[PDB]
Amino acid sequence: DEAKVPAYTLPAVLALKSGQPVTDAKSWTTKRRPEILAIYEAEVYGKSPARPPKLNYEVKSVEKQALGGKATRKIVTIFFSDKPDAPKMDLLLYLPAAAAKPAPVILGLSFGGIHTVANDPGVPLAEQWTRDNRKQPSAEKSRGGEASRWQVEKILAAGYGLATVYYEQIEPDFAGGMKYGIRPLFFKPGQTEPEPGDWGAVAAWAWGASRAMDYLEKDKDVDARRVGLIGHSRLGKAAIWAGAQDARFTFIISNESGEGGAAISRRDYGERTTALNTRFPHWFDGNYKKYNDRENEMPFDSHMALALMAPRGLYVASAEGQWSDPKGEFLGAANASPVWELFGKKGIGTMTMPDLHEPVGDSVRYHIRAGKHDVTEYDWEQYLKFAKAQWG
């Protein structure tokens, strides 16, 4: 019920903390954007390490005519650490078989192992984490189980490749899972746990997407100028911050990403933040918890986080049907859009929430669709049109 939504005044994305106004793109790039990035690094997602000077990886597998002659398939292992039994991740890549040149790639963070992304028997079954917080090999019945969320046939049809990484290889997603992930790798000598401004798990997943990018820009069959990033749900939060931190993504797609993602926090009284920091204490850094239930007012809201993409592409999307707030995510994008105008680009183009199946916008796009929390065939149809507008 929209009459029950509190009203509020958003922090001004185009004013500095002093109150001085941001007057042009120069001033955004040199003054305001660094200040917004610093705010979110300290109070929300946490400080991450710098880019590793050298990527340690191995191309484990390269096959032709995969997917019924439709694709070239690779599988690449990226090591976060020389040690043994150390954290590492398996990047799956499908490039179109007919590719005459290095091809654009959509990179994605996946909720399942690489065997869930297509119905491809050449792909080894991956060990996944379960409802009981155990890790164990996946059953063959699970192959292609996420296939409808990735629609690889449409992507190749459009002339593009798809790259995916299973996110829990970077850090498993349950409270207590940090010890199995990359964050312990960067502790100071005799450091037991993260300081309250250090990266949390969302930040860790984002940092992994950027190491996937490190590899994509070495692969001669990939157009390193034409990579984008997609994430769903909690991984849409990750994708927002990876986009903020990593200028190489020409666009990000953030599908139904909620609180700490695209959604405007001030549309409730801090209860989503508490629920998240309570149930998922690993997601955000220790400073974020002071904002629970408005015990402190946030010196930010989500339109500022989304503006960290400007002037690159941004697609926000929602589903009609729950525990989500689609209009909150629309208003995230619409209130970030002024920043794209500083650069001569077009944003959402409206402040009125559209109806079902009516995509709006140019460099910032939005749609709401029927159905449940998911990624569907309808979504990818609009995403691949976005991608064409973004890539030429």
Numbering used by the authors: 25 to 345, 347 to 417
Task: Give the article text.
The structural determinations of OtCE15A and SuCE15C reveal similar overall folds to previously determined CE15 structures, with closest structural similarity to the recently released bacterial structure of MZ0003.
The tryptophan residue in StGE2 (Trp310) found hydrogen bonding to the 2-OH of the ligand is conserved in the bacterial structures (Trp358 in OtCE15A, Trp348 in SuCE15C, and Trp334 in MZ003), whereas Glu267 in StGE2 which hydrogen bonds with both 2-OH and the anomeric hydroxyl group (in β configuration) is not conserved (Arg303 in SuCE15C, Val313 in OtCE15A, and Ser289 in MZ0003). Gln259 of StGE2 is observed hydrogen bonding with both the 2-OH and 3-OH moieties of the sugar ring, and the equivalently positioned residues (with respect to main chain) in OtCE15A, SuCE15C, and MZ0003 are Glu305, Glu295, and Glu281, respectively. However, in SuCE15C, the loop containing Glu295 is modeled with the acidic side chain rotated away from the active site, and instead Arg296 occupies the equivalent space. A small cleft within the pocket formed by Reg2 contains a conserved phenylalanine residue (Phe141 in OtCE15A, Phe135 in SuCE15C, and Phe117 in MZ0003) and a basic residue (Lys183 in OtCE15A, Arg173 in SuCE15C, and Arg160 in MZ0003). Three of the enzymes, OtCE15D, SuCE15A & C, exhibited exceptionally high catalytic efficiencies (in the 104 s−1 M−1 range) on BnzGlcA, which is 10 to 100-fold higher than reported for fungal GEs. To investigate putative lignin- and xylan-binding sites in our solved structures, docking simulations of OtCE15A and SuCE15C with a benzyl ester of 4-O-methyl-glucuronoxylotriose (glucuronoate α-1,2 linked to the middle xylose residue) were performed.
